[PDB]
Amino acid sequence: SNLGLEDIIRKALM
Amino acid sequence: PESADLRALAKHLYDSYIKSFPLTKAKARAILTGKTTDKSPFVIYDMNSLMMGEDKPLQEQSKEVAIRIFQGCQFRSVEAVQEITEYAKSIPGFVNLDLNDQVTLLKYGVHEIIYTMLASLMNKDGVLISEGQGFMTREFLKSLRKPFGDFMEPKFEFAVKFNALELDDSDLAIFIAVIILSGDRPGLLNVKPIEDIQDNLLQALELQLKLNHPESSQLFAKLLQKMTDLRQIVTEHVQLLQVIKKTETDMSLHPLLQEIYKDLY
Ligand SMILES: *c1ccc([N+](=O)[O-])cc1C(=O)Nc1ccc(-c2nc3cc(C)ccc3o2)cc1
């Protein structure tokens, strides 16, 4: 719950 | 040769869009029209039909109902976010961009794209919900208690106008790629290569609209204005955040209506 939109995106880019 | 390359770029994008997005505009419209094999969506048009619907539970409190809606819809957006991210990797030049910039471009871009997706699920009468098996009317949503009754109306207003352009998937692929390669997002490290890819995409889009819609008048121009409307729609959503935090009490909402809103954006 401290992991936001950027985490989802970064994960998906990797 | 220049034009051949603009056509090849459009095709690449279209093929990549079909690979990345299972929920296409053609599939939404086949459900909205009836062409589809299977039986039609259930229509929620009043409280009775709401209660008679159950195709989808804990007791939500008063001054949280709206924030819990925004949070919940944003969380259910993740599979879209991932789909958009995947599509973005296929846009020539994008993964050769600065990782930091890839992330920024998507962080802002996804919301505009999600609204474009939302438009495919809408017509002037209503919106598809519950994986395309339900249909919630515009009139019903507009009739709900303040502030909720004003949540969706502006998205319908945009969607009617946007859908009036009559774009298909092949057009939308390039449109969405143009939205993602916006060199004006806050915090971009190296803009030059971004605005350069977007210029190429803008060429491709112009030619695509000419070839796919030879009859139309200022379709390129009208479509570019929709980026403003999307921008505008995204910047706004905050103005809804702060009407909530001090509204003429109370914000009860029936639990099936709270469930339905979490399917929107
Ligand atoms: C969810 C369900 C229903 C409604 N509604 O108005 O009926 C709205 C929402 C909702 O939460 N919409 C929503 C949430 C966030 C944003 C948003 N977040 C952003 C972050 C950044 C960095 C840029 C732009 C953003 O837009 C838009 C809309």
Side-chain angles (χ1 to χ4, degrees), chain A, chain B residues 1 3-145 147-247 249-265:
Chain A
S1 69
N2 208 45
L3 295 163
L5 178 56
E6 294 192 19
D7 163 79
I8 288 313
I9 294 172
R10 189 175 292 108
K11 267 198 80 62
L13 291 168
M14 307 307 317
Chain B
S3 77
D5 289 359
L6 297 176
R7 295 203 59 183
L9 181 52
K11 176 59 169 176
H12 176 63
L13 294 168
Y14 182 37
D15 289 349
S16 185
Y17 172 110
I18 291 305
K19 170 167 198 199
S20 305
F21 304 121
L23 306 161
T24 67
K25 173 156 180 191
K27 291 186 199 171
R29 298 285 315 148
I31 299 166
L32 288 168
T33 56
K35 175 63 157 187
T36 183
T37 314
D38 223 314
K39 191 60 212 149
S40 341
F42 183 92
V43 184
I44 303 191
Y45 63 87
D46 60 16
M47 289 294 310
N48 282 175
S49 48
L50 177 74
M51 301 317 176
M52 293 302 297
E54 181 161 85
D55 312 344
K56 283 55 169 305
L58 293 309
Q59 320 301 272
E60 295 296 341
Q61 113 183 127
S62 306
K63 278 280 165 162
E64 314 276 40
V65 171
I67 300 313
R68 289 217 81 203
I69 280 158
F70 304 161
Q71 296 184 331
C73 80
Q74 290 167 90
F75 281 96
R76 285 172 177 190
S77 89
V78 172
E79 181 178 46
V81 173
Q82 296 172 324
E83 290 173 355
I84 299 163
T85 300
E86 195 66 22
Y87 177 59
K89 289 188 288 177
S90 81
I91 298 166
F94 189 84
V95 295
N96 292 258
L97 291 179
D98 173 54
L99 170 58
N100 212 280
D101 288 3
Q102 300 181 38
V103 173
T104 298
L105 288 176
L106 289 161
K107 177 178 169 78
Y108 285 88
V110 294
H111 309 284
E112 291 160 28
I113 295 168
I114 288 164
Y115 286 121
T116 303
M117 295 165 163
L118 183 59
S120 293
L121 307 178
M122 294 180 152
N123 64 23
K124 58 192 268 147
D125 290 341
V127 58
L128 291 176
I129 49 157
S130 158
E131 293 168 45
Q133 287 114 219
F135 187 79
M136 172 70 168
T137 71
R138 181 183 180 177
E139 176 193 46
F140 186 28
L141 283 162
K142 216 218 301 146
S143 82
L144 304 178
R145 267 76 144 93
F148 302 109
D150 306 321
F151 279 15
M152 302 308 298
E153 186 55 20
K155 327 313 167 54
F156 282 107
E157 286 178 88
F158 164 80
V160 165
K161 286 190 291 190
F162 184 79
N163 290 349
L165 309 173
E166 300 165 319
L167 305 185
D168 65 29
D169 296 288
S170 66
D171 307 316
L172 288 165
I174 313 174
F175 185 62
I176 287 164
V178 169
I179 292 177
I180 294 164
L181 277 108
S182 289
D184 69 323
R185 309 304 189 176
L188 289 174
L189 295 165
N190 197 353
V191 176
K192 233 296 229 157
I194 298 166
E195 294 170 330
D196 294 347
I197 296 155
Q198 198 196 44
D199 282 339
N200 202 16
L201 294 168
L202 285 164
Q203 292 176 315
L205 180 57
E206 193 181 11
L207 176 61
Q208 164 72 21
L209 299 174
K210 250 168 183 179
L211 293 174
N212 210 25
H213 310 274
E215 77 288 7
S216 297
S217 9
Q218 294 292 125
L219 180 57
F220 188 47
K222 291 164 145 145
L223 183 50
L224 296 169
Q225 299 209 277
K226 300 291 161 203
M227 297 186 43
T228 301
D229 294 26
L230 287 159
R231 279 295 188 103
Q232 165 201 321
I233 295 263
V234 168
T235 51
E236 281 171 46
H237 164 82
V238 305
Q239 291 190 291
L240 199 46
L241 273 312
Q242 319 316 169
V243 171
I244 289 152
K245 222 202 81 232
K246 27 222 161 75
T247 305
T249 180
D250 78 305
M251 297 184 227
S252 168
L253 186 56
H254 195 276
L256 302 168
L257 296 169
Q258 292 179 54
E259 229 309 313
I260 296 312
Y261 270 102
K262 283 172 192 176
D263 274 356
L264 303 173
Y265 207 69

